[PDB]
Amino acid sequence: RALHQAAVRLCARVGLRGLATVEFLVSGERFVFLEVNPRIQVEHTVTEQTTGLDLVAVQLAIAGGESYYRLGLPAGIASDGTEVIGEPAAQRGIAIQLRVNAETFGADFSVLPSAGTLTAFCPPSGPGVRVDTYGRPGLVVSPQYDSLLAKVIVAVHGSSWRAAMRKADTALSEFGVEGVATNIGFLRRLLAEQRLETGWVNTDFVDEKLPELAAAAVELYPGEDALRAQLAGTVVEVAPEGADYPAGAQLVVLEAMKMQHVLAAPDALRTVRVLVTPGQVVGTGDPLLVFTRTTRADLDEVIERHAR
Amino acid sequence: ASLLVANRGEIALRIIRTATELGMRTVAVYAADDAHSPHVHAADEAMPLPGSGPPAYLNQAALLAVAENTGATLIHPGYGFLSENAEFAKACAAASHTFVGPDGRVLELLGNKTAARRAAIAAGVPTLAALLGDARHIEVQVVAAPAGHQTHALAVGDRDCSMQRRYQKLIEIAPAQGLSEELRRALHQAAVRLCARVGLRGLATVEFLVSGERFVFLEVNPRIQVEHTVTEQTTGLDLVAVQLAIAGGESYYRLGLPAGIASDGTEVIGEPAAQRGIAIQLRVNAETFGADFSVLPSAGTLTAFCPPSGPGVRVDTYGRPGLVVSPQYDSLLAKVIVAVHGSSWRAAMRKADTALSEFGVEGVATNIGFLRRLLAEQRLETGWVNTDFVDEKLPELAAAAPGAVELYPGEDALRAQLAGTVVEVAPE
Amino acid sequence: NAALAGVCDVIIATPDANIGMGGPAMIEGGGLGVYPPEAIGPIAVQRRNGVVGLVARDEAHAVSLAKQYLSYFQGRLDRWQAPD
Amino acid sequence: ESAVRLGYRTDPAERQNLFDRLVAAAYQHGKALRAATTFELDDVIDPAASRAWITRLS
């Protein structure tokens, strides 16, 4: 309430018209005014995904001459130029916006701008997932302009932060980019951090953990089948290529958490190629190995005809 | 709670996602055939099904077997397949697994077209003899859960599913455009009364045939539906979560759903619900036009895949770069769902077109051009079309079916100041 | 007709050119549906994958280029003008 | 099938039926034995004969 009140109060006074972001620096319960941005901001999107507002459409409406009361915005703390009234706005769910940039790492964890042609580009989608990007297959990223490639915004109903970070990571994983180096790996590595499970980190976190995080970066011919991992885990033991197994025989042994899951032969089968090696890590669905379960009328028409 | 998703394709992947947000452990299943569908890698556990192809997913013993070995608490049938099969529902209950859907008898009553029509009449709703004139397909989305000891049914929203080709839906619209708040209220009130009267628990879509100010009951679907998405975009709701909440034992009142016409297991009360903006769902299928404006399923490897993505644009897909598309299953490739604030239907259409134009697919033929041309139709500019429209304009529409350029230094490119057709060019 | 054309050293085509191994009748006989000939080997697609070697303004120009192309494999020229 | 899909153009629901009727039929007059008749193939052999032929290649 104090930060909302500080913002509205400040903006009315300076006679602002349109959008504006007031930046503060909280520290426990103590805070300080940091800066005011009288423009649309890159992270306006998370506010949209939680209030339902089209901030760009409001900007325009106001610029077109619409009045405050005619914009019909939702409740919230507002300052009628002199006094402050209202209960804090209502923000539904949780939204996380991740900035995917065409940039790569250099020498001493330095950061360099990537360039190239997106031969493969496929923004994560599905419900609760939004992507504001100017990228498309064929687009050639220039090192000359800002590196932001796409903005991935995931939202979740209610308020399970745990659920939000999960959704965020999944989103980032399903994002396919080929041709330009990105920081999807870094961001991914960054969501996995623990301090961040508390709901937030401070301004220095990502800088004191940069070096740590910078470092941490099949067809079948007819008759063949593929034995897949039942769930994620680490391959402990695998069968050899070209052995005959009876229905039920042990074929693979994975080590998910602390226990061992044993994949058995669906039934009598000979193993063909083996795509997994012991020690290696696999995930749900991952193909472990290939195997094979275990009169000619036309030829008589030929034998006959030739005999004639 | 543990969830087994007894389905495949996009709907499976859809359910897996809401289940994951809620924190449930999910188990997916796949016909030896459907090995690389996205829903497999997305789940926590994925047991392989015995059979192959569509009929594999009907193997009741197989599923119940998977549910036993993974210790799945609930079972979600999705849509199609076993979703409306009473035997399976009862079999789940029997095995002591919660079937995410209505009761076993409800599926029998509704599963029987003859029986349902009777239930319909019984609850005071007009019906077909069988062959109505100039009609629109209007569906009312219902949510039904018990409160106290009675069944309460709420009408969360309505959709326009007129645009269909040989009875297969191409474009759903929410809300239904141009319905007197008299007729609307009449449809919502009919839907919740019919739903509560047959003791339904969970989601259900009451279908109607509208002609002018007259309408008639058509059918009921006690399952989640493919076009549930436009209801979500205009309602705010996550209909899958609700489905699960109801399945887990939650009551009508503790579901905290938006206001609307409801039937508190006595009389009907409330005002039509609020449906923010307009949403359009386009079914992009992997299929192409044949000789006689016929429809041939497509097939191939998605060499390039990149769905539309922006504010107000949602894509519930099943495809992804690399995936090999098979004609062995439903030809749906992705469900592009655009929504726009306010009520400008014309704005909504523009967006649907743009969304489609930004949809990049390669290696498989799609109906994107068709859908794209079907949106240009002038009649549709009035907010809606009838059930015969798409089938009649098929031949006329079927008949209707930027690349980075380097510049050496010292050269400049004369670009098209606006979109249009070339009529004359100069000599190279 | 295309097969022959793509077994050659160079292919001189005019903007209205459409080269493809499969004719709309073949794309159809293969069950891939029906497409109009202007959507098969656009002088734009073939201009990029290196199928069309020279793009002519018009028919008289294409024949002009063909005459010029051969000239390199036909001999030396007597009259020649050096640049500055 | 390329031949049938072209020389025959009506089925509302399932065409796959009448199709594989013209196909399985036309096959009889486009098989190997027939081709061998006009000498469009040097022979139609018993696949166990594959080696004896290849052998003459070296």
Please report the DSSP string for A150-189 in residue order: EEEEEEESTT-HHHHHHHHHHHHHH-EEESS--SHHHHHH
Cβ distance D6 to C28 less than 8 Å, yes or no, reads yes
Structure method: X-ray
Cβ distance A302 to D47 less than 8 Å, yes or no, reads no
Determine the 3-state secondary structure of A222 from DSSP: coil
Which amino acid belongs to residue B79?
Y
Residue of chain A with shortest Cα separation from B320: A122
User: What is B1-401's CATH topology?
Assistant: D-amino Acid Aminotransferase; Chain A, domain 1 (3.30.470)
Question: Is there a contact between B57 and B82 (Cβ–Cβ < 8 Å)?
Answer: yes
Q: What is the number of other CB atoms lying within 10 angstroms of the CB of residue A5?
A: 16
- The verdict on D11 touching B (C-beta cutoff 8 Å) is yes
Straight-line distance from the first to the last Cα atom of chain C, in angstroms, rounded to the nearest whole number: 45
Cβ distance B292 to D5 less than 8 Å, yes or no, reads no
Interface test with A, best of D28, D33, D41 (most A CBs within 10 A): D33
Q: What is the number of other CB atoms lying within 10 angstroms of the CB of residue A273?
A: 14
- Kindly give the pairing relationship between strand B74-76 and strand B98-99: parallel
CB pairs under 8 A between A and D: 9
Cβ distance D11 to B291 less than 8 Å, yes or no, reads no
Burial of D51 (0-12, 13-18, 19+ CB in 10 A): exposed
CB pairs under 8 A between C and D: 13
Cβ distance D1 to C29 less than 8 Å, yes or no, reads yes
Angle at B397 between CA B395 and CA B398, to 5 degrees: 60
Cβ distance A57 to B320 less than 8 Å, yes or no, reads no
Cβ distance A228 to B48 less than 8 Å, yes or no, reads yes
Residue D31 and residue D41: Cα distance in Å, rounded?
Answer: 11
Report the neighbours of C using a cutoff of 3 or more CB pairs below 8 angstroms.
B, D
- The verdict on C34 touching B (C-beta cutoff 8 Å) is yes
Residue of chain C with shortest Cα separation from D16: C31
- C-alpha atoms less than 13 angstroms from C-alpha of B297 in its C-beta half-sphere: 15
**Residue C42 carries which DSSP code?**
B
Chain D residues with CB under 8 Å of B297 CB are none
Resolution as reported, in Å:
3.0
Angle at B353 between CA B351 and CA B355, to 5 degrees: 65
Residue A188 and residue A172: Cα distance in Å, rounded?
Answer: 7
Chain B residues with CB under 8 Å of A73 CB are none
Cβ-Cβ contacts under 8 Å for B57 (sequence gap 6 or more) = B6, B7, B8, B29, B31, B49, B51, B63, B81, B82
Chain A residues with CB under 8 Å of B21 CB are 128, 156-157, 160, 163, 166-167
- The verdict on B376 touching C (C-beta cutoff 8 Å) is no
Cβ distance B403 to A138 less than 8 Å, yes or no, reads yes
The crossing angle, in degrees rounded to 10, of helices A44-51 and A55-63 is 100
Smallest Cα–Cα separation from B110: which of B182, B189, B206? B206
- Is it true that the peptide bond before A38 is cis, omega within 30 degrees of 0? no
Chain D residues with CB under 8 Å of B291 CB are 5, 9
Please, what's the largest Cα pairwise distance for chain C? 60
CA C56 to chain centre: 9
Question: Is there a contact between B316 and B335 (Cβ–Cβ < 8 Å)?
Answer: yes
Cβ distance D6 to C31 less than 8 Å, yes or no, reads no
Tokens describing residue A39: 């423009």
Chain B residues with CB under 8 Å of D10 CB are 292
The CA-atom distances, in angstroms, between C36 and each of A153, C1, C14, C33, D3 are 41, 18, 18, 10, 20
Burial of B147 (0-12, 13-18, 19+ CB in 10 A): middle
Residue B83 and residue B203: Cα distance in Å, rounded?
Answer: 12
Report the neighbours of B using a cutoff of 3 or more CB pairs below 8 angstroms.
A, C, D
Contact present, C and A (at least 3 Cβ pairs less than 8 Å): no
Which own/partner contact pairs does B128-133 have at CB distance under 8 Å and 24+ positions apart? B128/B209, B128/B216, B128/B218, B132/B209, B132/B211, B132/B216, B133/B211
Nearest to B288 among C33, C44, C55 (CB): C33
The CA-atom distances, in angstroms, between A84 and each of A1, A2, A34, A76, B192 are 11, 11, 21, 10, 44
Smallest Cα–Cα separation from A172: which of A156, A192, A152? A152
